Structures are given as structure tokens and as C-alpha cells.
Design a protein around this ligand. Structure first.
Ligand code: 563
Length: 248
């Protein structure tokens, strides 16, 4: 019964999803308004997001319980990261900015890890970007760990698998993993121990990190806090003699 607000207090301005809007709350604060079909399940369907609070996670500000439904949240300047990587900023990005982006989210997930939650669909489409290349965790077998796609063993260690796949999206400016292979072909070949090669111009030492997130044994995959610290320290500890190339 807390968080609750009057419906007059939030003006919805521009559509985004299919719904989700940009607006204003108390005629001041800029906000993202995740509507509800009244519904659609609908009051099922929030407390999940009220239980979690962190800088690299997206924030719930307030709600409307009785129908029709409304949820208000932090607005992210630059939209979802998959669109940002392929589109105009795609061609200008480089390793230094790409590894910082990757570090920030590793932070988000190290909160979720510490809090004993599990996200279950970490990937570029579900990260949001803001001003100053700020990125945050928000709200498909190719991204999904084996245990999870097959047998439903979703854990924090299935999220880190998905992370390493997200590392490949950063490195190809947002290409779908496993170029030219459909989901059934991925599933069987990955069971063989196949794992994507080193992308062009991406240094071998980062490809190793990718390969460590993708181990066939969940336990052996590293923590998010290891993952954060490693990407934080990259250009001093790992590739001190890095040199700008044509894409990276
Ligand atoms: C049904 C939609 C869904 O599950 N997720 C979703 C929601 C929105 C979305 O697009 C989007 N969310 C935004 N900000 C948000 C969203 C939230 C929840 N906080 N801040 C901003 C945005 N832009 C796209 C193009 N830009 C030039 C203007 C801004 N798009 C893309 C995917």
C-alpha cells in the first residue's frame, strides 16, 4: 500500500514499446511509464523490483494498484543497448568504451548475485543505456546456458554464461551470436564443446574471458565480482600494449 500515487500526477508523452511511454511525474521528474493492459493477467503481474535497489539497476519510483494498471520508473536516455550498438554509435565505439560498458553491468549483476536473485534473460536487448555511456540491467536459446535451455536450471551461473555471449555482441557491434546457424544447430554444436572463435581484432585475452564464462561446468564459471574487477583493470593488467585498430 506504500509507493501509491494519484493518476492525475503522471502525464504520458511518447510511445516506446508495444506498452511503454516517456512522461513526467508530479510535473517535474522525467520517467518511463510501463503500462498494463487491465489485462493481461493483469494484477498478477513490481514487489520484485521494490525488493532491489542499486546504481547499475533500473529503479521503480511508484505504482497504481486498482485498474487500469500503471508502473513508473527511471528513464534511460539512450534506450536499449542492442539498438545503440548496431545504429549510428556502432561504428565509433572501441575497446576502451566497450570494456567499461561491460564492467558496469557486471556491477549490476554483482548486486543481484549478492542479493540471491537470478535475472534469467541477461542480454543486450535487456540492458538500457543512458547519457555518458551509462548502462543498467532492466526487466532465446542462443543467449541461454545449456542447463537452463534444456533442463530449466536457471541460476546466477546461467546469467554469467549469458554475460559472455553479451561480450560477443559488444565486440561485433551487436551481431546475433553464432553467425549463420539456427537455434537447433547451436544447441547440438555447443553440446560438442564448440564455442565461437575470437572476433576480428578482439584481443585473445578477452576471448579467454568469453571462453571462461562458457565452461560446460556451472561451478567453474567465475563470479560477477571477479568479472567486474577484471574488466575494470583490463588496460593496465591484461593488455597494457593495446593499440587502436580499424574497428577496435
Ligand atoms: C514491452 C517492452 C519491454 O519489455 N522492454 C522495453 C521497454 C522500452 C524500450 O525502449 C526504450 N526505452 C527507453 N527508456 C526506458 C525504458 C524504461 C523501462 N526505462 N527507461 C528509451 C527508449 N528510447 C528509444 C529511442 N530514443 C531516441 C529515445 C528513447 N526506448 C525497449 C524495450
Amino acid at each position: 500500500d506504500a509507493w501509491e500515487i494519484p493518476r492525475e500526477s503522471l502525464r504520458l508523452e511518447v510511445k516506446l514499446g508495444q506498452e511503454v511511454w516517456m512522461g513526467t511525474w508530479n510535473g517535474t521528474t522525467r520517467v518511463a511509464i510501463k503500462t498494463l493492459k487491465p489485462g493481461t493477467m493483469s494484477p498478477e503481474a513490481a514487489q520484485v523490483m521494490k525488493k532491489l535497489r542499486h546504481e547499475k539497476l533500473v529503479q521503480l519510483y511508484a505504482v497504481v494498484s486498482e485498474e487500469p494498471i500503471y508502473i513508473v520508473m527511471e528513464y534511460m536516455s539512450k534506450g536499449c543497448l542492442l539498438d545503440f550498438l548496431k545504429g549510428e554509435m556502432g561504428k565509433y565505439l572501441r575497446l576502451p568504451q566497450l570494456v567499461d560498458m561491460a564492467a558496469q553491468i557486471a556491477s549490476g549483476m554483482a548486486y543481484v548475485e549478492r542479493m540471491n536473485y537470478v535475472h534469467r534473460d541477461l542480454r543486450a536487448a535487456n540492458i538500457l543505456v543512458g547519457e555518458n555511456l551509462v548502462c543498467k540491467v532492466a526487466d532465446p536459446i542462443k543467449w541461454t546456458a545449456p542447463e537452463a535451455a534444456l533442463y530449466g536450471r536457471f541460476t546466477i551461473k546461467s546469467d554469467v554464461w549469458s554475460f559472455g555471449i553479451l561480450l560477443t555482441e559488444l565486440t561485433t557491434k551487436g551481431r546475433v551470436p553464432y553467425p549463420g546457424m539456427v537455434n537447433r544447430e547451436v544447441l547440438d554444436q555447443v553440446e560438442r564443446g564448440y564455442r565461437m572463435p575470437c572476433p576480428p581484432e578482439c584481443p585473445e585475452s578477452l576471448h579467454d574471458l568469453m571462453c571462461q564464462c562458457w565452461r560446460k561446468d556451472p561451478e567453474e564459471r567465475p563470479t560477477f565480482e571477479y568479472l567486474q574487477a577484471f574488466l575494470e583493470d583490463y588496460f593496465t593488467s591484461t593488455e597494457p600494449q593495446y593499440q587502436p585498430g580499424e574497428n577496435l
